[PDB]
Amino acid sequence: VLFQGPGYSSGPELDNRVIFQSFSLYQPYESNMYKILATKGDLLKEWGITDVWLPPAYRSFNMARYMEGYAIADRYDLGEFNQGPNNERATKYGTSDELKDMIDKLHAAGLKVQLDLVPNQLLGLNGREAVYVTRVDNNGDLFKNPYTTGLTTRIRADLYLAYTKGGGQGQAKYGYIKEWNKNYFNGTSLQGQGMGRVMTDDNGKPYRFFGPNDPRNYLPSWLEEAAAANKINTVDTYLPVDGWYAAKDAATSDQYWKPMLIHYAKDKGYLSFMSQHGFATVDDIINGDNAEIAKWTNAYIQSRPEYGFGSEERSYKNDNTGVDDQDQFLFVEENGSTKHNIHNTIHGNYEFLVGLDIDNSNPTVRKEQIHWMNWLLDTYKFDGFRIDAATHFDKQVLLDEADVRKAHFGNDLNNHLSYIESYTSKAEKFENENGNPHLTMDWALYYTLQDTLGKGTPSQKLSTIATNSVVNRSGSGSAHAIPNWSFVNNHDQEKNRVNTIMLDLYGIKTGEKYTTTPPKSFADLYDKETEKKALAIYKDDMKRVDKKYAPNNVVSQYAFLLTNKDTVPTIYYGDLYQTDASYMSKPTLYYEPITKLLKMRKAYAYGGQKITGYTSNTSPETAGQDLIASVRYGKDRYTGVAVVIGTNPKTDTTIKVDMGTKHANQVFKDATGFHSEKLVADNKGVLTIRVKGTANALVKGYLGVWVPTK
Ligand SMILES: [Ca+2]
């Protein structure tokens, strides 16, 4: 008879929680965020923040676009080891010691903290192995080049040298797995090593070198000296095109190490490139200093598609996410079979995103993940986890994560939140089937807010904000709402909008079919100057009236988000603060209105919820098209709030907003500051509200947020 597992239940208790997403991608590499955030506990308390989502604190691949901590080179180095640029301890955000102290101070302020947990992938390991690859999309289905030739790929169980082995000193010291390798990955996003990277004969047989004596060797005439000598650069017996070998005087002479491209017959273009770079003859190379050899012989490698992305059939989708997740190799065996199970995700497919995709179906990997989570709670005292890419790996890991929390904190779920990053309703089904061990992300309301209120001149009925949510708030509300965390904006969706600007600047349309023209690559073109330009554009756009890129009616969105019954709302860092400035140095035009909306919620956001649709002059036919009221009735006469919203600047109507009988003959005041009229509720607690349409930077249509005196 076991009693381990209430699960989350949506109700007034859980509705008390508010998550602050503490970070964006565009924060500067300043190694100071922890030191600063350590001081903000009281401020956060004022707003009714209960939980702080912290960035992924792990060591970043050094060439990561944002250095943010999702491209993980070492999963156990959170600013502890000397593995940063110039062997610094600090991550983007600061040292482990600073992280420890900051968590200490934030607990001291009565807040909880979640780490951004990243089970899906690693990126940027230093050591290569040989794998077989099949060219597949994000779902692991054979890739069909839909934006180029439309041909089904013939890259099927082909030989490839990938970066698959490493993991840093953290892993090596604290890990269950001590080193990652190819066996532990379902595959990798294209690494631009090229399909001709292994040295082959004229038919297609790879060259092999196990040892000097070995009868399993298969080399050409010329390498037999280096073979007997045992001086060939190899990878798992295979010969890489970039590899060097003892050219003249094999044994007992290590001053004649030379690029083996010299007599690699299949490449007919190298010797000629070295011609037009000083080294005119076969033997001019065999002499010259390897500084200027290496320099030039390398730059050749990069010019050849057989040795780069040019042979790997990139999708060239140029998705505004900044990742073409159809750019994958599945790790297969020689016959094209695979040990890797890629259909255990919440999606059912969609195993692949970016980087070295972790085989979360491998029982050793699964033990490694439990070990990892354990070590994180134990070492850092996080209270829970924001689960990154939760819908793109073996979902067992999610259930294991819940057990890790149970083992740590018991049935005290509410004070130990976990919330999964989700953009599909399959997350809802999964959660409900398993007793709701996590908060599911309200993706649906996010897109619904963007279409009704985010868009200038909305083409979608504003009333849809009631229905088009993981929680259906129409009529009386949801009797049994799914436990959920909701948002108006986040680090990804912002980055999307910025990338859209960059694409515009680069002259690239996402999804364009390149039949007759050369395809263009966002990835190849990415540069910091263009990013700087795009950021400048983005911020200006927020401040303008007829916004082009940034969303309209940010305050209207938050006013709805922060007054909804049955949800944990999220406050996004970059909605309150300029995204690319020093951490919490510069507020936005939305800072004042939102922080106020926060004090309001904390004071007034109690009781039943009712959403009434209205007619306006602008829509006399269909009620709720452009005008609505989202009412929290209050628990007592002194709580509750009427959120009135319209989407048309012209609108000129007077509507009746019923607050219930307990709000009879009571003074209501707009908490937003937008209207300074003092309304009095009638006999029955109805408000007569004159709706004067407007258009500036904050509002397009109408916002009123009417709260009683106390
Ligand atoms: Ca995956």
Residue numbers in the entry: 26 to 735
Task: Quote the passages of the study that discuss this structure, keeping the authors' original sentences.
We determined the crystal structure of GbGtfC-ΔC at a resolution of 2.25 Å from crystals containing one protomer in the asymmetric unit consisting of residues V26-K735. The crystal structure comprises domains A, B, C, and IV and is the first one representing a non-permuted GH70 enzyme. The catalytic domain A (residues 26–144 and 387–630) contains the (β/α)8 barrel also found in other GH70 enzymes, but, like in GH13 α-amylases, it starts with strand β1 and is interrupted after helix α3 by a long insertion, forming domain B, as well as the auxiliary domain IV, which is absent in GH13 enzymes. Domain B (residues 145–222 and 333–386) has the central twisted five-stranded antiparallel β-sheet also observed in other GH70 structures but is more compact, mainly due to shorter connections between the β-strands. Domain IV comprises 110 residues (223–332) and is much smaller than the corresponding domains in GtfB-type enzymes (usually about 170–180 residues); it connects to domain B via two loops that lie adjacent to each other. The crystallographic B-factors for domain IV are on average higher than for other domains, indicating that this domain may be flexible due to a hinged connection with domain B. Some of its residues hardly showed electron density, but since domain IV superimposed almost perfectly with that of the AlphaFold model, we confidently decided to include all residues of this domain in the crystal structure. Overall, the architecture of its binding groove closely resembles that of the 4,6-α-GT Lr121 GtfB, more than that of α-amylases: while the latter features a fully open binding groove, in GbGtfC, the presence of the two long loops A1 (residues 532–552) and B (residues 338–352) near the binding groove results in a tunnel-like architecture that encompasses donor subsites −2 and −3, similar to the situation in Lr121 GtfB.
GtfC-type 4,6-α-glucanotransferase (α-GT) enzymes from Glycoside Hydrolase Family 70 (GH70) are of interest for the modification of starch into low-glycemic index food ingredients. Compared to the related GH70 GtfB-type α-GTs, found exclusively in lactic acid bacteria (LAB), GtfCs occur in non-LAB, share low sequence identity, lack circular permutation of the catalytic domain, and feature a single-segment auxiliary domain IV and auxiliary C-terminal domains. The first half-reaction is α-1,4 specific cleavage of the substrate and results in a covalent enzyme-glycosyl intermediate, which is transferred with α-1,6 specificity to an acceptor substrate in the second half-reaction, leading to isomalto-/maltooligosaccharide (IMMO/IMMP) products containing α-1,6 linked units at the non-reducing end. With a limited hydrolytic activity, GbGtfC releases mainly maltose instead of glucose from amylose V or maltoheptaose substrate, synthesizing a main product containing alternating α-1,4/α-1,6 linkages instead of consecutive α-1,6 linkages.
